[PDB]
Design a protein around this ligand. Structure first.
Ligand SMILES: O=C(O)c1cc(=O)[nH]c(=O)n1[C@@H]1O[C@H](COP(=O)(O)O)[C@@H](O)[C@H]1O
Ligand SMILES: O=C(O)c1cc(=O)[nH]c(=O)n1[C@@H]1O[C@H](COP(=O)(O)O)[C@@H](O)[C@H]1O
Lengths: 256, 256
């Protein structure tokens, strides 16, 4: 098993994955903050304070009450300053012709500011083809959703195998997965795992939690995605540091 | 098999489905226009001119370059005038806690203006639970995506059966399906079918077309969803009338 720094140099590595893996090793962080807030001021204050602790900030641009492209300009300034990637968790899931417009256009112009986006594989490979026609020219990457954290997920068995095949056949654009575990044996592919908290539990709407030690150490994922475990805490900086140290040590102990 | 007008009166009918079925029978239309345009002025001129020919106008609010809630105010005025429902084709596909915010909030406030939305079933029933916590109080309905028109779709076999079970277990909010065919034997549930053109063919990004006669007459669906077959035509009104007459006759001939 290679370190993040060595994976950053693999011959078939995507440039976006390489940039991410380099800053993960430099900063000793494999934490992605899920910045699940409705106010731009809160998003930007979290990005500034937690920027040093995170490899990635995950957005849902469509829950932000005061979205403007200028808010995203301020977010890019913080991403550059503190060295993290921006991941818009848009979960594209339409025919190729539709997702290309959803990615490039409308009010959000997601491709103009998002290093990474993600897509469901259920529509077939046209979803990836459509996104890549915008994303390849704009030097972006994509994650495919191979497994989900929620109760009753149908992303199991043959579905997960289809997501891995799709990623591997579109390596020019697909840089990894949203998954609960290592699903690809190819080290060029990132595994990002949501549904993470230090304590056992869930929410009232089908979210299920596992610990950083379980998903990084035992299940072999690379990055934890954490929302409420940080966002709902009083001291979001110390919460981020707890998650960072947990995920980083779990990674180091798997490397041996 | 019951007429649309008789289905509108079924004991377990959802009020949104009832309203739709009534106006389909009154206007002799089972055509949903996929208003896949980037300009508000074009969206509104299509809605006004084609309103009499359609039972439903399907939006992708996130490809509209000049979206404002006022544009949607003007669309509701046309929907009320000409009697059609508004369907935002958002394809919610996240955990329940996230989709409730995506549905109610952000810039789009989808639940404030959309009669219908749709959701993927891959995350499990939490997606429906989250949406219904916004949509039930706002008297809205939802369609579940049981089958898709695109090449390589994984929405087949057990997946489609899971979508039908999920819809049937959430009939307070779920009013039907996006499907290629009749998938539910319960007549209270609408079947809407995209991937429709009069001529054989497809697009370059995995879209596949079938005719109105095939999907309404042979496959037993209720409503055709048509985008480019109308939108790319020179005379969009005459194109809409051709699709309307095709879908309506296919429906009548299945009734006998
Ligand atoms: O794509 C995602 O990040 C995602 C996939 C998934 O399977 N589960 C999942 O929870 N998510 C997202 O990750 C975040 C989880 O947030 P918390 O449950 O608050 O930690 C939310 O923003 C979800 O939308
Ligand atoms: O939910 C949808 O309407 C949808 C589901 C599906 O399986 N296939 C599909 O084409 N659609 C949508 O229906 C429309 C099809 O447009 P045309 O291919 O131009 O007729 C697009 O807006 C798609 O996003």
């Amino acid at each position: 098993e290679l370190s993040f720094g060595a994976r950053a140099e693999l011959p078939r590595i995507h440039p976006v994955a390489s940039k991410l893996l380099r800053l993960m090793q430099k900063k000793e962080t494999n934490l992605c903050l899920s910045a699940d807030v409705s106010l731009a001021r809160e998003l930007l204050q979290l990005a500034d304070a937690l920027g040093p602790s995170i490899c990635m900030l995950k957005t849902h641009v469509d829950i932000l009450n005061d979205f403007t492209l200028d808010v995203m300009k301020e977010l890019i300034t913080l991403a550059k300053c503190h060295e993290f990637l921006i991941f818009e968790d848009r979960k594209f899931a339409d025919i190729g012709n539709t997702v290309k417009k959803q990615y490039e256009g409308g009010i959000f112009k997601i491709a103009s500011w998002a290093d990474l986006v993600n897509a469901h594989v259920v529509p077939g490979s046209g979803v990836v083809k459509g996104l890549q026609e915008v994303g390849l020219p704009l030097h972006r990457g994509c994650l495919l959703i191979a497994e989900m954290s929620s109760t009753g997920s149908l992303a199991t068995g043959d579905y997960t195998r289809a997501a891995v095949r799709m990623a591997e056949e579109h390596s020019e654009f697909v840089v990894g997965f949203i998954s609960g575990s290592r699903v690809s044996m190819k080290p060029e592919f990132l595994h990002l795992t949501p549904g993470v908290q230090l304590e056992a539990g869930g929410d009232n709407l089908g979210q299920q939690y596992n610990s950083p030690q379980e998903v990084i150490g035992k299940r072999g994922s690379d990055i934890i995605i954490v929302g409420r475990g940080i966002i709902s805490a009083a001291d979001r900086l110390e919460a981020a540091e707890m998650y960072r140290k947990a995920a980083w040590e779990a990674y180091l102990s798997r490397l041996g």
